[PDB]
Design a protein around this ligand. Structure first.
Ligand SMILES: *C\C=C(C)/C=C/C=C(C)/C=C/C1=C(C)CCCC1(C)C
Ligand SMILES: CCCCCCCCCCCCCCCCCCCC
Ligand SMILES: CCCCCCCCCCCCCCCCCCCC
Ligand SMILES: CCCCCCCCCCCCCCCCCCCC
Ligand SMILES: CCCCCCCCCCCCCCCCCCCC
Ligand SMILES: CCCCCCCCCCCCCCCCCCCC
Ligand SMILES: CCCCCCCCCCCCCCCCCCCC
Ligand SMILES: CCCCCCCCCCCCCCCCCCCC
Ligand SMILES: CCCCCCCCCCCCCCCCCCCC
Ligand SMILES: CCCCCCCCCCCCCCCCCCCC
Ligand SMILES: CCCCCCCCCCCCCCCCCCCC
Ligand SMILES: CCCCCCCCCCCCCCCCCCCC
Length: 264
């Protein structure tokens, strides 16, 4: 159904590819647990008016920890070692590699990552509810559309790219609203706070952009290329993990540093 199931059923995964993926996916949820503690223990550092950011971050941590731990458990329990060939192949008796776990974490997270910023920075000419509604509708849509096309990653590479194209449309609209929010939030805050808001915008752009990259990591070097193999799966899962810590944990950390900066 997905690229990881196909490669695991045809050429198979080497011992290092399988060992490396389960390791990156373990490090993935382990830092979410660490992030959950950081946000809980640091709430006393920010004034009451900003604590909504810590709360939102902590709930994202929980969602990330639970679902990413299941994604890892699903990966390891999805392949078995064939001593006769020397590689890990799809196990007909297991439940297969399912991306729905990662895609459900995204759906729960988008509304909270985009909402929490509006609890630290202030808008000027924009309306609070107008920005929030645009963030929730388009953030959900980019995800349900990215999940619809992900079903044809193998079955139909045309629908894979069209759905990913529509999903991107909603994605670039978010970057647009996120840019006005950071421009308005900069007004009336000290130069120190502005610098952090600039770092946040840059981290938001790269981190969220990493996702579509992994969505295409295999079909990047062609239909018979270096990444159209077990290496493309190692790079996709790796890219997801980097974007996962950056867009969820690092992003939330920077917001807290901003809130800390604002109370002076
Ligand atoms: C886990 C938390 C968040 C905010 C995840 C965000 C993920 C993306 C922005 C993914 C975007 C996609 C794009 C742009 C196109 C293909 C489908 C994706 C969902 C991977
Ligand atoms: C030669 C590869 C061994 C497996 C035979 C099946 C061909 C690959 C198709 C795998 C997906 C099943 C439809
Ligand atoms: C100023 C420092 C703020 C750090 C907050 C995030 C804490 C977790 C960062 C990742 C650390 C490694 C997680 C454990 C790996 C095993
Ligand atoms: C100021 C609070 C610092 C918390 C340190 C968290 C250590 C990693 C998570 C446990
Ligand atoms: C300053 C960078 C801190 C990075 C997080 C370290 C967490 C260590 C936990 C033990
Ligand atoms: C509300 C914050 C936590 C969301 C949890 C959503 C359900 C996660 C289920 C994981 C296993 C499937
Ligand atoms: C509705 C689209 C958002 C992602 C939902 C996918 C949920 C998959 C849960 C696992 C499926 C059973 C195994
Ligand atoms: C304030 C948070 C509102 C959104 C929570 C639910 C997120 C999507 C769940 C489906
Ligand atoms: C100069 C500020 C450095 C931390 C800002 C956030 C970017 C961290 C990248 C790792
Ligand atoms: C803020 C995070 C910066 C990540 C830069 C990209 C890291 C390497 C991604 C490509 C790997 C191939
Ligand atoms: C909108 C999707 C952006 C994906 C960027 C991928 C960059 C690949 C560079 C080669
Ligand atoms: C401020 C910049 C914080 C950078 C922390 C990065 C931690 C990544 C942990 C990977 C294991």
């Amino acid at each position: 159904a997905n690229f990881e199931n196909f490669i695991g059923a045809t050429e198979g995964f080497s011992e290092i590819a399988y060992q490396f993926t389960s390791h990156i996916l373990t490090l993935g949820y382990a830092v979410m647990l660490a992030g959950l503690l950081y946000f809980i223990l640091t709430i006393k550092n920010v004034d009451k008016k900003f604590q909504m950011s810590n709360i939102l971050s902590a709930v994202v941590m929980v969602s990330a920890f639970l679902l990413l731990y299941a994604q890892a458990q699903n990966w390891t329990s999805s392949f078995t070692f064939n001593e006769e060939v020397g590689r890990y192949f799809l196990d007909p008796s297991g439940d297969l590699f399912n991306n729905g776990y990662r895609y459900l974490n995204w759906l729960i997270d988008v509304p909270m990552l985009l909402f929490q910023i509006l609890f630290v920075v202030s808008l000027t000419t924009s309306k609070f509810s107008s920005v929030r509604n645009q963030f929730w509708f388009s953030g959900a849509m980019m995800i349900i559309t990215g999940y619809i096309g992900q079903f044809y990653e193998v079955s139909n590479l045309t629908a894979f790219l069209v759905w990913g194209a529509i999903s991107s449309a909603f994605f670039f609209h978010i970057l647009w609203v996120m840019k006005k929010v950071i421009n308005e939030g900069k007004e009336g805050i000290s130069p120190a706070g502005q610098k952090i808001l600039s770092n946040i915008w840059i981290l938001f752009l790269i981190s969220w952009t990493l996702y579509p990259g992994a969505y295409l990591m295999p079909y990047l070097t062609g239909v018979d290329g270096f990444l159209y193999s077990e290496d493309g799966v190692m790079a996709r899962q790796l890219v997801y993990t980097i974007a996962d810590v950056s867009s969820k944990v690092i992003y939330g950390v920077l917001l807290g540093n901003l809130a800390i900066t604002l109370s002076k």
